[PDB]
């Protein structure tokens with residue numbers, strides 16, 4: 001039995017970043033960059049107007065002037081020089097014609113004379129300064145500037161920067177492919193209606209398929225496997241040979257006489273641990289299998305108890321997926337929060353207590369902060385204790401009652417940007 | 423020009439939850455439940471062992487006893503009664519045979535005699551209590567108990583609860599379908615290499631496609647549209663008739679003489695506003711179009727400036743997607759944080775200043791909390807100001823320099839569970 005911090009250190013030490021691949025721009029979203037990106041041209045590549053109005057010679061000052069060209073895009077005004085005593089109409093993003101050194105926004109101007117006559121004239125109502133409302137070449141992005149670097153995760157703004165730079169095929173770290181199976185003679189498919197004696201619906205498999213889909217990985221669903229050593233070996237050898245990077249099993253890892261996951265993983269590879277000092281998730285097995293040519297497969301013999309299964313996925317499998325996906329910060333967000341109710345900590349095993357947390361203007365102490373409500377009874381067989389739980393409170397093994405208003409460390413396990421407000 | 427709080431109130435008031443649909447279990451992930459879910463049978467549906475060991479009569483106490491059956495799943499031990507003076511082998515999740523009222527874990531037992539002889543005997547090493555290590559029928563979930571309710575978002579634990587309850591087809595609120603187009607004679611596709619005079623790559627479209635994909639919505643990519651009124655009307659009528667729920671355009675909404683988005687939206691529907699008091703995102707247009715039979719289409723005439731485009735998406739479009747998707751808490755997470763450097767606020771427009779935020783053990787004041795670093799120059803044409811930005815600091819329009827260490831409100835715009843730790 002090892003502490004969770006040691007089990008996390010071992011998993012991290014064995015887990016290796018996947019070889020990079022080339023993907024399309026839309027396939028690059030969510031992925032970590034495996035190359036630096038440089039701008040091939042400046043942004044803007046031409047002097048551009050910040051406003052809809054008139055490009056002027058600043059030194060001319062307020063007065064009435066003829067409009068000698070109109071510049072909105074492309075070759076508009078090419079070969080036209082705005083000389084002292086003239087102006088050019090411009091729209092935002094329009095190229096500044098040669099000779100103009102400032103832009104006066106349309107609100108500080110007035111058109112003079114009849115619009116029907118070909119010759120347009122405008123009254124500039126202010127005294128402007130050279131450079132006003134013009135984006136010089138390269139002011140937003142300089143040519144050859146690094147706009148994105150290796151190790152940076154691609155979100156919407158990063159896709160926008162790749163498009164700005166003309167990069168539609170991107171070198172990234174891929175997501176791992178994950179195989180998932182359930183174990184047990186007592187299991188039936190979740191499509192089962194009336195259950196026969198001693199049967200339960202397989203809930204862990206669909207739960208883990210959903211959890212892995214939330215981490216943006218491809219899933220290989222290997223179904224229900226019975227408590228038969230040859231059958232489980234065949235399905236594990238099949239998963240190892242299929243090209244997946246991670247295998248997730250649940251159940252068949254406790255002290256039962258037909259719990260074959262641990263001895264099969266010892267036979268096929270290297271088991272680093274099979275027991276962890278934690279509440280819930282004690283029978284967790286982690287192993288490294290080498291697939292014959294030629295790559296490493298990580299195997300997590302997750303516990304059968306639904307709560308223990310999901311907590312072990314959240315604490316150990318999520319950072320492993322991220323490490324394989326090239327994240328430099330794979331660890332989960334940890335915050336500090338105040339308890340909204342008293343919670344009794346366990347006397348021997350530190351607890352990952354499920355909570356529903358929210359940000360409050362007053363956390364109970366006068367200042368703003370996160371607050372936590374327990375999900376109730378914490379039994380490892382009670383999947384209702386994971387319902388709506390967006391955090392795991394880290395309760396040390398003291399045996400004391402932590403009173404309402406006391407502060408604890410909490411691992412956030414679900415999208416902080418999808419947190420329901422107070 | 424209206425304040426952002428009024429623009430958000432108007433958008434919320436017009437936006438209506440989409441009609442619910444029936445989807446498969448894996449399609450239900452991320453979606454909000456449109457029906458309550460009740461357990462059709464209890465969990466466990468039979469008295470189940472919490473441990474691998476022996477089912478006993480508690481009153482028998484420590485002693486040596488014959489093992490009369492073995493119970494791991496299904497019909498194991500059916501018709502066998504554990505009477506006083508006998509025990510039954512059980513594995514975790516195994517049905518408790520009739521007559522046994524407690525379980526003694528295998529660690530508190532010892533097998534006696536030769537294993538080869540058919541008759542097995544075990545020594546129970548402790549005095550147990552009635553009910554120990556047995557999960558009674560329905561202790562985790564009672565039959566007909568409500569396990570999930572209308573308005574609850576489906577995450578991995580909720581998929582696990584649907585599978586437990588045998589629900590593989592779920593009534594949910596769907597995500598809206600979003601049409602996206604760019605406007606401008608100066609735009610070229612992001613596949614363009616060398617740019618001609620007065621051209622830029624279309625970056626907003628791929629950025630908004632990525633942003634909408636992160637919100638789990640289907641995208642209808644309508645491409646680049648030129649600054650031609652008939653062309654833009656045709657593409658808008660096409661989007662309205664196609665069945666999308668939201669149209670996103672960018673550009674063609676400022677004061678230019680070929681900015682046709684506003685007048686086209688006024689003609690096709692009801693424009694609620696076209697100008698907002700905010701830095702960045704001032705030219706935002708919001709309109710409601712009625713598609714002929716027969717449904718409502720929401721249209722956001724987003725600003726062309728890349729920063730303004732993404733900030734307006736993050737503040738106004740993200741809660742609208744969530745409201746249409748049936749979220750009861752569509753608003754973004756707002757927290758309070760301390761500035762890591764000084765920031766000058768604008769004297770007239772309140773600013774959505776881009777920041778990279780992280781949780782620190784000491785936020786600078788001695789206690790733990792969020793801290794923010796600015797992304798630098800905040801110009802609306804500078805997409806590099808959105809790079810890695812996971813929050814928008816809400817700076818009031820005071821004109822004062824907010825010093826390092828002062829606290830501000832911040833909107834979190836990207837997965838809090840994907841936050842890089844300190």
Ligand SMILES: Nc1ncnc2c1ncn2[C@@H]1O[C@H](COP(=O)(O)O)[C@@H](O)[C@H]1O
Pocket residue numbers: 048091092093094604605606608609622623624625626627672673674675676678725726727728
């Ligand atoms: N799709 C786009 N990608 C990048 N920049 C754009 C896009 N559309 C408009 N812009 C720029 O945003 C600014 C305002 O656009 P508009 O509202 O059309 O005048 C101008 O500088 C445009 O060149």
Ligand SMILES: Nc1ncnc2c1ncn2[C@@H]1O[C@H](COP(=O)(O)O)[C@@H](O)[C@H]1O
Pocket residue numbers: 182183184186187200201202203204205250251252253254256303304305306470513514515516
């Ligand atoms: N796929 C599953 N879905 C729900 N419960 C399970 C699953 N697999 C195992 N269990 C339960 O978890 C507990 C421990 O399983 P095991 O480690 O196989 O003894 C037992 O009560 C099992 O019935």
Ligand code: MOO
Pocket residue numbers: 278279280281282283303304305308380381
């Ligand atoms: O042995 Mo556990 O910690 O109830 O899965």
Ligand code: MOO
Pocket residue numbers: 700701702703704705725726727730802803
């Ligand atoms: O007019 Mo803006 O607020 O630079 O898009």
Ligand SMILES: [Mg+2]
Pocket residue numbers: 183184185251252304515
């Ligand atoms: Mg089992």
Ligand SMILES: [Mg+2]
Pocket residue numbers: 093605606607673674726
């Ligand atoms: Mg334009």
